[PDB]
Amino acid sequence: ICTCIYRRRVWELSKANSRFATTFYQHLADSKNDNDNIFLSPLSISTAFAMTKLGACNDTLQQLMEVFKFDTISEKTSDQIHFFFAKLNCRLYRSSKLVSANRLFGDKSLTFNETYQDISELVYGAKLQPLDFKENAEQSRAAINKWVSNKTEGRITDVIPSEAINELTVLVLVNTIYFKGLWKSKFSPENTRKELFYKADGESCSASMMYQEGKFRYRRVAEGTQVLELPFKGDDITMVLILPKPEKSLAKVEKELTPEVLQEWLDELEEMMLVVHMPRFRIEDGFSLKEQLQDMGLVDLFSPEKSKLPGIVAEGRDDLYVSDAFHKAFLEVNEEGSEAAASTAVVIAGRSLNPNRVTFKANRPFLVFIREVPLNTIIFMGRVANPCV
């Protein structure tokens, strides 16, 4: 945009968004078997719900502000949050594509308040779309899924699974962020070799390991955890990997992740000339945020008995509540970046490199982050626990 209440601005909100991001990851991770891959965008989640908060009141509002940690932005009122999001968004959605598919669908004569409509449209770029859930749920589901697959250029198709929508749904929320980007320092396909990945428990399996030597921001911190930042073409988006000393389990790294120690690691990285080895991997993960969030304190927005949602009116039957909330994420990373494999081979001539150069061999499970650096905003988060094919 660039030009009911509870209680630079971009730096404050990025911090809030990061604390939620860590906590939601730690919970989601806690819920899972270690050999499972995780990948999700906290920013679409915090953004989708900050857009939804626009219509809530009384206690619903009060806890949205609290679950997503926006209440950490001291001396600010809930309305102020949407200005901060307006700023953050302007900047974010200016060889790095960031496409945000985000929407609130609903209809059984659900009329959104004029201003809800307008601020969602202005600050979040969302449309609050009337969809006939009542008479034709299957076409409604199909329609939603088609809208997302259009926004995400064909990747992320089955957002809304099947049964989750039917002639009883009121409002459903769907969000994702799509990123397509090329590596700053591409790997050459001629040095992609099958090697052994050593799983969280036990199994050795074959991943296609990529290799390159280059200058990257790296540091080896406490308990031998190596942090490494690889960048995309155009130095504002980077991928940060975290690989623990093989004695220490990643699981433990997850458990001790404060956003504060995450930052502390970033400040300890320096440009350094090293040898990189990391698998090519595809991670796709999608889910209903609803149970996860409920368990974290977001109860009232989903309860027909408790949802204070002034923003939306229905003729007579006012017990409007968020029936479901879905989120999917897809990452396919290879030698070129997060985009189409083209056979760009690489020839480096005239480089004699020091022995006793540090090696980075992510051949055992590691965390992944996709960080927007100027804004310091975590766009994606994950754990490549098994890239075997």
Residues that bind its own copies (CB under 8 A): 186, 188, 190, 195-200, 204, 207, 209, 213, 215, 218, 220, 224, 226, 228, 241, 243, 272-279, 281, 342-354, 363-364, 366, 384, 387
Residue closer to its own copies by CB (options 56, 240) is 240
Question: Which residue do the tokens 């309860």 mark?
Answer: 303
- Least distance CB 337 / its own copies (angstroms): 13
Residue closer to its own copies by CB (options 316, 350) is 350
- Least distance CB 230 / its own copies (angstroms): 10
Q: Taking the CB of residue 306, how many other CB atoms lie within 10 A of it?
A: 14
CB-CB contact of 27 with 295 (8 Å): yes
- Least distance CB 251 / its own copies (angstroms): 15
Residue closer to its own copies by CB (options 324, 335) is 335
Residue closer to its own copies by CB (options 43, 276) is 276
Q: How far apart are CA 175 and CA 153, in angstroms?
A: 15
Nearest 10 degrees: CA dihedral of 110, 115, 119, 125? 40
H or E stretch covering 110: none
Token reading at 2: 């660039």
Token reading at 243: 């690989």
CB-CB contact of 196 with 206 (8 Å): yes
- Least distance CB 246 / its own copies (angstroms): 10
Q: Is 11 annotated as a binding residue?
A: yes
- Least distance CB 365 / its own copies (angstroms): 8
- Least distance CB 352 / its own copies (angstroms): 4
- Least distance CB 148 / its own copies (angstroms): 29
Residue closer to its own copies by CB (options 137, 209) is 209
Residue closer to its own copies by CB (options 279, 286) is 279
Q: How far apart are CA 298 and CA 260, in angstroms?
A: 25
Q: How far is CA 17 from the centre of its chain?
A: 11
Helix 9-30 and helix 259-267: axis angle, to 10°?
110
Contacts of 181 (CB under 8 A, 6+ apart): 95, 96, 97, 232, 233, 237, 337, 338, 339
Q: Are strands 322-333 and 171-182 parallel, antiparallel or unpaired?
A: parallel
Q: Taking the CB of residue 378, how many other CB atoms lie within 10 A of it?
A: 23
H or E stretch covering 59: helix 58-67
Q: How far apart are CA 66 and CA 363, in angstroms?
A: 39
Residue closer to its own copies by CB (options 195, 332) is 195
Report the binding-site residues for heparin: 11, 91, 103
Report the binding-site residues: 11, 91, 103
